[PDB]
Structure 1
């Protein structure tokens, strides 16, 4: 009957998706059935898609994730054999917010700021940026921000000194990966009113 689709080819295309194409098999295929799954998963966790043309876009995938996939053809007699297996990884996406900020009071003018890695890295985190400045009683910034680039992603703690005694400050931490910077995690803190 129908032969196996030939030259299966895949490539990341856009956000959370993969363009998977192949060469129609000898004979008269009426369509194609694609099976794909996260690399490492049992085919029991595979997803099934149909297509009338020799290509298909796999969507709603996880970012920076490895996928495996194969395709077979079907016609009047039934389904033919599956093509060989191809693998492909999805593009990165900016990380989510870092974990909630934690503060240790070293003195009336110094604090240690720490944070957990974002719940969703969506890639490989290469840095963090800490920003902070004075805010009024309504928590509104009233002066320029101070920014510190953290080059070592494992160093999720920063000592901040020379802070104005008994004044509230707004602190934020944002993370970067291959796709760029993500949203910021925020906290309003006054070292004088901390436990």
Structure 2
């Protein structure tokens, strides 16, 4: 219909940003090793990379991991503490900016051989 509007100049706002990614996948290669994998979220613009921030659930040191590859949807986290929870918050970045991030905490469990058939 008719044209013409009035108001702030909010149009270039971050819209092509990557939507919150899906749950994460932990491998736990070991007591001091792990592997977080996410799912390429929706984004009108091509992603430039990813960010995997992890830190003691309770509250300790926060380590930010940058991904120079927008295709690599998986990273191996090592140098962790045994029997300690870590909040792994994965985030995505696109030509626009940083979108949402998925929360995923893991509990290092050593000396566990699953169930026992009998």
* TM-score, shorter chain, exceeding 0.5: yes
Higher relative contact order (CA 8 A, sep 6+): 2
Unaligned runs of 5+ in 1: 1-49, 58-90, 137-141
Shift of residue 124, structure 1, vs aligned partner: 1.2
Match of 1:93 in 2: 16
Match of 1:158 in 2: 75
Shift of residue 92, structure 1, vs aligned partner: 4.8
Shift of residue 191, structure 1, vs aligned partner: 2.1
Higher normalized strand content (fraction of residues): 1
Greater than 6 Å deviation, 4+ residue runs: none
Match of 1:174 in 2: 91
Shift of residue 56, structure 1, vs aligned partner: 6.1
Shift of residue 179, structure 1, vs aligned partner: 1.3
Matched pairs, number = 104
Instruction: Provide TM-score, normalisation by structure 2.
Output: 0.79
Unaligned runs of 5+ in 2: 6-13
- Which residue among 31, 43, 64 is the counterpart of 1:121? 43
Larger Rg: 1
Preserved contact between residue 92 and residue 123 of structure 1 (Cα < 8 Å)? no
